[PDB]
Symmetry: C2
Subunit: 190 residues, 2 copies
């Protein structure tokens, strides 16, 4: 993961000081797509959302079966994310899942709160899905920041928006990433 300074240099954000308008665009692009149905998600976000929904509904067998298939099919190919389809169909309209999806407007902030909610059922460490680091580094870092106070710079945008939706008490389509800008500005000032 990049250092704040390494991140600022990579995206040409040094004006020290920060190019704030540029940093706003970078962090907004980091935030990724609106949530508008799990079938529009990436296969890896779809499958892991299904694991977390299963755990929230105390279906440990279904959650573990997805994770075991993704680990085994990763041995010699891409993880077979399609195995998650029946678990998604079973739980995407369940009361506990609807309650979490209600609170967040972006794929990345929805799935962060699904992981947080799944950890009410037990431990769900990222060591359960190590294949995610080569498959989708951004989602990997985001999920590994669930439960942390400070994010990696490469997910500071969606992390900030996630916390802002919690603070506001509602989902927000308008990006709320100002805490990422403030944090990067402070870390850059050495």
């Amino acid at each position: 993961a990049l250092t704040p300074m390494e991140f600022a240099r990579k995206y040409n954000l040094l004006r020290a000081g920060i190019r704030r308008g540029d940093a706003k665009r970078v962090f907004t692009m980091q935030l990724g797509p609106y949530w508008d149905g799990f079938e529009r998600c990436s296969p890896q976000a779809y499958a892991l959302s299904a694991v977390f929904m299963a755990r929230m509904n105390r279906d440990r067998d279904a959650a573990n079966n997805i994770l075991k298939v993704l680990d085994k099919t990763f041995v010699d190919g891409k993880p077979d994310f399609s195995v998650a389809r029946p678990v998604m169909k079973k739980y995407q309209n369940s009361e506990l899942v609807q309650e979490v999806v209600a609170k967040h407007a972006y794929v990345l902030t929805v799935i962060a709160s699904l992981l947080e909610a799944a950890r009410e059922d037990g431990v769900v460490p990222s060591s359960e899905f190590l294949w995610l680091k080569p498959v989708d580094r951004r989602l990997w870092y985001m999920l590994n920041c669930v439960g942390r106070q400070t994010p990696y710079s490469e997910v500071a945008g969606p992390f900030a928006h996630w916390k802002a939706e919690k603070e506001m008490g509602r989902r927000s389509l308008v990006p709320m990433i100002d805490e990422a800008i403030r944090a990067l500005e402070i870390a850059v000032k050495e």
Copy 2:
């Protein structure tokens, strides 16, 4: 992982159908479907380095060997601690393979480890037999070192073929050599990969 046909195509190993060779190399049939010399080179390249001290191995081969040594000596906490540390440090950087050093120091001269290392001459065939012996102590699945696939795909494929009858083509060389060392009952510095060529020939004929 490539299928045998995909592998043969990638390395240009297929001969034309209905071959009738004027000058086949030693060990190559006049009607061979595989370029034996080119196949020998590719499978030998897969074998990798001689074993000559674990300190000369890659960091990932070193750390996983330590895990397997610990299981062979019934030290589950030492093994599980390494695996957990490697999973956790993988999150934002390279796995911290140095966590394995005290465990390597403790067990590399142990009776059961010496017996395995005696039997194999290559890093890949030593570590394959160490994994095999570790599984006498319990389950040691590759799902517990899934970071290895992006780190070192050859070692990843090798370790995932321990316990199989048939290897992935990308480690058919070291797999064949591993089995040949078992069959001969001794380590062999001379490469023994003929079975890998033979299996590719059978696989190509069985298609076509």
